[PDB]
């Protein structure tokens, strides 16, 4: 269903997600990873299913180039693929709204960050689930709101390109 | 005068010593991998040196200088990168051109005036303003990008192949734009591989090789030594190549020709 | 970690063999319950590390970004799990002996997971890891999915990561040169600074996608099926080491676990 | 011996009121470097993509494109891409493979060439250009000229009959452009294949075997370079400068030294100056 031009664009967006995942913006008090920009790009432009594919392949590509810091595990790929799935479910082919940004960021944070990842961390490293959750609850309480504010301005930037000449389809 | 004092950059530059007085069209030549872009980024403190002093536009850049006080420098020294149209992001042309003045201290009414004046100067049509920059063509996008970096009237404009990928007519238009910008009293630094522009427009020719300055002279004295030019790694202007062919054909030419009009005039003088 | 070149026999091992070895090592580190099981997994992991022959510098580079998390998790599992003898008794902290050994177990699970995955990312070139991952995605064909499409997307993304990173650096330099303070000015102004970094990048991605798709369709890319493969991965005699090593690990984990 | 003959063509760009090409008509002689110069808005950008079917003319009944007797259409678009190979403008984008020997082998993979013959052909085509030492070098470790050489090798390896240098040397330094042109000329002599040059670089059209000039989607004039270039007045109203030799001839004419108009090469002009020097 997806044309070759759209497949190459998906590859470019995956490369963007990997590059931004290696980025960390802010001062020393807080370092929010810029992977959410790639997740929003994959979900908003390609949909939930190609978003899932792009998220899994971006996890594989990040493992290939920059190395999998946490050990090669399938669950991390599943989480990094379910991120763009929810982003696409809430944001694909829909008008830009603050409501959808709010819901998509909150649902991805609940399910992927303090959800599945806490399950995979507790399974791999053997700690009790509440211990891993308390380990990972701090940054994922103040980080999602910064993601919220940044995502509101990403979609404004991406829309002005899609409604422009450069984006054909 | 832009002055570099034993400037070096590691992780490449090595002991560069020169002084470009303000108001001249300095041209920067050399093959890729000779640290030309490193010098270009050093000009406005994008890459601070590891050891040395840069006295550019009245501000001193030492290795230990911080990021505070650089925004005051970047208003005077502006860098235009290769394929500058890749940086266009705003919703319209006018906002994209005035994005520079807005964060270089211009008010909303001042930035609009400067952006409109420079959009007129670069040759963009008046109906093209207030349209999305992506709607335009490659030449028009290059014009918008160039207007975005000349908008606040920088003292030292340091360019990087501003007409790469453009036709000779558009290339000539842009080159005459920058040469007219020079006549206003602003220094222009041109980082190009096309020596046919260097022999025509430049008044002072830098020459890098492997990260070390090897020649700093007027283009007449740079291209007079073909033995040195081939000894190092540089190319000759086409007009100079033709003159060298004429000498090897037994037809002697007076003086040193480097541009097409002076080459033609020398040919006319030699025959008569 | 990046590919540090070498000559030790681990570099001769096919990337499909040792990617499966890394996955299987994670699977059998899931099976570590008793102390003797942890001893078996630790000696096997350290034997793998020594047989790789890398210096400790690269491994200690790899451990460092997570060492705060390692010590935090070990000390948290130390306090939450309590049993046996007691030291340092307080309402919040109790340095019980079972706490210390459980913290040691979690530390070992951090060590044998990071050291093994550091061996893969250092001793296999990224293109070979891509070939290995395509081989691991070969079984997906029984879900009637188009695995050739996935392999093509991975290959193009890997080829175009360095060029897009250079483009990102160039774009950030171009926007900084006209006054983009990318890290000063508060949250909502910091968020507005990702548009000048992303929209030019998206424009470049659109241009590169159109140009590359046009070039591929010009050179004769009719589909993902019917093409031969130029860069093949071939087995070797030295691949008997992982299949024996991973098999010899299964015996001890099954026999040794507390169940 | 026409190879490509676009006859009464029309392209509208799916969006724009004025069509890009309007009743274009020409023929490319077999074994001749045919340069096709025009302005950016003249529509020459789509000639290359129209030739091998990536764009279709609006009226397939009125507009007929023939490539080696294979009338281009929805069915025969793949046989036409086994004869016509195009080298596009930007070297970075068209470089698909993760190494040099993989970008060259990407054309041969798509035709299901067996791997041993694939290796032989890839080695021969990579050594044909001056890239024998970079058979494992990555895309980002190569220059602008080197990536264009690899693109030319990849187009070559599939044994094409037309090589369309579609603005190939647009982004290269003048030393790289000369190297690419020497390489392409040597390849064209060795393999006996047609080369079509869609460029705005007039020096490359100065050495062609036939020059086609386009204004606003139509064929303005054609013929040898010795005829299109001297009429500088025609090239002035369409926005095109003339090559160095002809520009110097016009400058000398303005000075007062008139020269005959068949002088096209550099050596001819210097010798003609020498004959005037003796006087």
From Swiss-Prot, chain B:
InterPro entries in the record: AAA+_ATPase (IPR003593), ABC_transporter-like_ATP-bd (IPR003439), ABC_transporter-like_CS (IPR017871), ABC_transpr_CbiO/EcfA_su (IPR015856), ECF_ABC_transporter_ATP-bd (IPR050095), EcfA2 (IPR030946), P-loop_NTPase (IPR027417)
Superkingdom of origin organism: Bacteria
UniProt GO molecular function: ATP binding; ATP hydrolysis activity; ATPase-coupled transmembrane transporter activity
Coiled-coil residues: none
Main location: membrane
GO cellular component labels: ATP-binding cassette (ABC) transporter complex
A Pfam family that the UniProt record links to this protein: ABC_tran
Gene3D superfamilies: P-loop containing nucleotide triphosphate hydrolases (3.40.50.300)
Nucleotide-binding recorded as keyword: yes
Signal peptide location: none
EC number: 7.-.-.-
Localization: Cell membrane
Family per record: Belongs to the ABC transporter superfamily. Energy-coupling factor EcfA family.
Function: ATP-binding (A) component of a common energy-coupling factor (ECF) ABC-transporter complex. Unlike classic ABC transporters this ECF transporter provides the energy necessary to transport a number of different substrates.
Protein name according to UniProt: Energy-coupling factor transporter ATP-binding protein EcfA2
Organism per entry: Lactobacillus delbrueckii subsp. bulgaricus (strain ATCC 11842 / DSM 20081 / BCRC 10696 / JCM 1002 / NBRC 13953 / NCIMB 11778 / NCTC 12712 / WDCM 00102 / Lb 14)
From Swiss-Prot, chain D:
Keywords assigned by UniProt, alphabetized: ATP-binding, Cell membrane, Membrane, Nucleotide-binding, Translocase, Transport
GO molecular function terms attached to this record: ATP binding; ATP hydrolysis activity; ATPase-coupled transmembrane transporter activity
Protein's UniProt keywords contain Cell membrane: yes
Pfam families linked to this entry: ABC_tran
Localization of this protein: Cell membrane
Main localization category: membrane
Root EC class: translocase
Topology in membrane: Peripheral membrane protein
GO cellular component: ATP-binding cassette (ABC) transporter complex
Keyword DNA-binding: no
Residues that bind ATP: 38-45
Sequence ranges assigned to domain ABC transporter in this UniProt record: 6-241
Oligomer and partners: Forms a stable energy-coupling factor (ECF) transporter complex composed of 2 membrane-embedded substrate-binding proteins (S component), 2 ATP-binding proteins (A component) and 2 transmembrane proteins (T component).
Family assignment from sequence similarity: Belongs to the ABC transporter superfamily. Energy-coupling factor EcfA family.
Protein name per Swiss-Prot or TrEMBL: Energy-coupling factor transporter ATP-binding protein EcfA1
Organism expressing this protein natively: Lactobacillus delbrueckii subsp. bulgaricus (strain ATCC 11842 / DSM 20081 / BCRC 10696 / JCM 1002 / NBRC 13953 / NCIMB 11778 / NCTC 12712 / WDCM 00102 / Lb 14)
